[PDB]
Each structure stands twice: as structure tokens, then as C-alpha cells.
Amino acid sequence: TTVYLAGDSTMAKNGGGSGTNGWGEYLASYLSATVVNDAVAGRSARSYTREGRFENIADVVTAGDYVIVEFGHNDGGSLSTDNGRTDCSGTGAEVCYSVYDGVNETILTFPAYLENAAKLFTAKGAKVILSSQTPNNPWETGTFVNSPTRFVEYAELAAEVAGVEYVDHWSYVDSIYETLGNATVNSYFPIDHTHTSPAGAEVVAEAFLKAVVCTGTSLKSVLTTTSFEGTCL
Ligand SMILES: *[C@@H]1O[C@H](CO)[C@@H](O[C@@H]2O[C@H](CO)[C@@H](O[C@@H]3O[C@H](CO[C@H]4O[C@H](CO[C@H]5O[C@H](CO)[C@@H](O)[C@H](O)[C@@H]5O)[C@@H](O)[C@H](O[C@H]5O[C@H](CO)[C@@H](O)[C@H](O)[C@@H]5O)[C@@H]4O)[C@@H](O)[C@H](O)[C@@H]3O)[C@H](O)[C@H]2NC(C)=O)[C@H](O)[C@H]1NC(C)=O
Ligand SMILES: *[C@@H]1O[C@H](CO)[C@@H](O)[C@H](O)[C@H]1NC(C)=O
């Protein structure tokens, strides 16, 4: 069995650079399956699609493999100054057009990109898990702020529409960050409020697996242990 990971610098090998790392690098130790980390820094649901990276997973995924998809950090902003990452606003079948990189691009909503990827994989027999984005440092200001982005609820919506599994990685990470406290969580964010140090990436991976165990996600079948701190939500 293979587990394919799709996401951004919060998941990817080498993180956002400068000594940071992504949570996907800490998962294989806890799974009896092979992990393929196809996350890449800087990507959004839009740009991951445009670059053919969902298609590349589709080519190689087979029945019974898992695909975990987690976007949101790079999906906001303004199409008026199109950075190639921002999705069209909305939750459904809305379309936006913008010239980017020499093309008048057709741009979908965040849920539509995820639903489309999910359909591709599901029709081949893969088990798709959509996961909400991780939080930026919720202790940046010295007290704890739980401020989910719109992309958290959008991932849940996309899973419901596509008929696949949802894991609320956001909430499980923010729950453990609240309990770890100001000093420790700030130490996970060495250069900015997004990219985690190796210790933080490990915590973030553990929180994904806590969510899986607590929610009963299908991936539980390949987990090697359930010994993770925190509580079920
Ligand atoms: C929540 O946890 C926080 C993190 O643990 C904790 O904040 C830390 O508190 C300790 C104790 O007071 C401070 O340690 C003291 O630091 C001063 C020197 O401080 C100044 O220099 C540091 C280092 O600057 C260099 O490195 C950083 C990081 O790479 C660069 O950004 C920077 O450009 C330099 O190269 C700097 O981090 C400090 O900055 C904080 O403070 C200034 C205002 O004073 C803010 O403007 C800034 O946003 C930031 O908050 C500061 O410029 C040293 O003289 C002492 O001996 C002692 O070592 C840590 O500085 C402080 N760290 C941070 C990240 O804040 C919070 O207190 C805690 N919050 C709550 C409400 O409890
Ligand atoms: C981009 O394509 C759309 C769809 O055909 C069109 O409405 C829009 O005018 C095009 N944009 C540019 C700036 O011409």
C-alpha cells in the first residue's frame, strides 16, 4: 500500500527552507505503508492542479492506495495582483479568469479543485482523505488565538460533496498548541509564523495521527501505534 501526500511547505520535505521541515516527513515512521511526499513549497490547490501534480499522482495511484490532500495556506489573496496561487472565491462551481504566466487561465474555487482531484483518485479505487490546513503560529502575539481560515470549513465541504473522508488537522494541531503553551509553540516557528522547525513538524504529524485515531479514518488500518498525546475533540 502507498500513501501519497499532496500539500505545501507545511507538509513538504525541507519545509520553507532555513532549517524548517514539513509534517509529511514524520509520517512514515508511524505507518506500515510506503509514504510518497508529493508536497511542494508555495503551492495552492490552483497551482498544484495547473502544474499537473494531481494528475501525476493520478497516473501512479492504484486501488487501495491512500491520497492525503491538505491545502489552504497559499489559497487566499487578491486576483487583482494575481500571484498564480489564489483560487476563485466561492464554494461551488464559480469560475474566475485571470492572465497569469502568459495564459488566460480558467480558475476554480478551492472546493472544486479538491473535489475534482478526489474524483480522479476515487474512480481508480484510491482512498482519499481531505485534511484541513495547519494553523499559523497561534501564539505569535503571546496569548492563544484560535482563528480558523475559510479553507478549514471549505475542506470539510469538499469532502462531503466528493464523498470522501475528512480529517480536521487544523483543530487537532490548534488543540495541542493551546496546551503546549506560549514558549514551546513559539520555538516551533524559527523564522516566520508559518513554517515549523523539525520538532514542530513532528508535533503536527502526531496531531494528524491523533485525529485519524479519534475520528476512525480508514488510514487507521496502517497505523503502527495510537500512543499520541492530546485528546479527542
Ligand atoms: C511568549 O514566548 C516568547 C518566546 O519565548 C517570549 O518572548 C521572549 O521573551 C524572552 C524573555 O523576555 C526574550 O529574551 C530576552 O531577549 C532580549 C533580546 O530581545 C531582543 O532581541 C531578540 C533577538 O533578536 C535577534 O534574533 C531574532 C530572532 O531571530 C531576530 O528577529 C532579530 O532581528 C535579532 O537578530 C528578539 O527576538 C527580541 O524581539 C522581541 O522583542 C521586541 C521588543 O522588545 C519585539 O519588537 C519583537 O517583536 C520580539 O517580540 C528583542 O528584539 C535579551 O536581551 C534578553 O537577555 C532575553 O534573552 C526574547 O526576546 C523574547 N522572544 C521573542 C521571540 O519575543 C514572550 O515573552 C512570551 N510572551 C508572553 C506574553 O509571555
Ligand atoms: C479571459 O477568457 C475569458 C473567457 O473567455 C474572457 O471573458 C476574458 O475576456 C479573457 N480575458 C482577457 C483579459 O481577455
Q: What is the CATH number of the domain that holds 191?
A: 3.40.50.1110
Q: Which of 202, 214, 210, 229 is nearest to 27 (CA)?
A: 202
Of all ligands present, the nearest one to the C-alpha of 79 is: 2
Q: Which residues are catalytic?
A: 9, 192, 195
Supply the range of the domain harboring residue 41: 1-233
Cβ atoms 221, 30 nearer than 8 A: no
Judged by DSSP in three states, 96 sits in strand
Query: What is the distance between the alpha carbons of residues 222 and 35, in angstroms, rounded to a whole number?
Result: 11
For residue 226, which amino acid is it? T
Q: Which technique was used to obtain these atomic coordinates?
A: X-ray
Q: Which of 73, 199, 56, 203 is nearest to 136 (CA)?
A: 73
- Residue 200 Cα to ligand 1 middle (Å): 19
Q: Where are the alpha helices (DSSP H) in 8-80?
A: 45-50, 53-60
CB atoms within 10 A of CB 97: 11
Cβ atoms 70, 169 nearer than 8 A: yes
Cβ atoms 57, 6 nearer than 8 A: yes
Give the CA distances from residue 35 to residues 4, 70, 169, 214, in Å, rounded to whole numbers and listed in that order.
6, 15, 18, 21
Tally of domains within the chain = 1
Q: Where are the alpha helices (DSSP H) in the chain?
A: 45-50, 53-60, 110-123, 150-162, 169-180, 182-187, 198-215
Resolution value (Å, 1 decimal): 1.1
Q: Is 182 in the pocket of ligand 1 (CB under 6 A)?
A: yes
SS3 content of the chain, % helix, strand, coil (to 5): 40, 15, 45
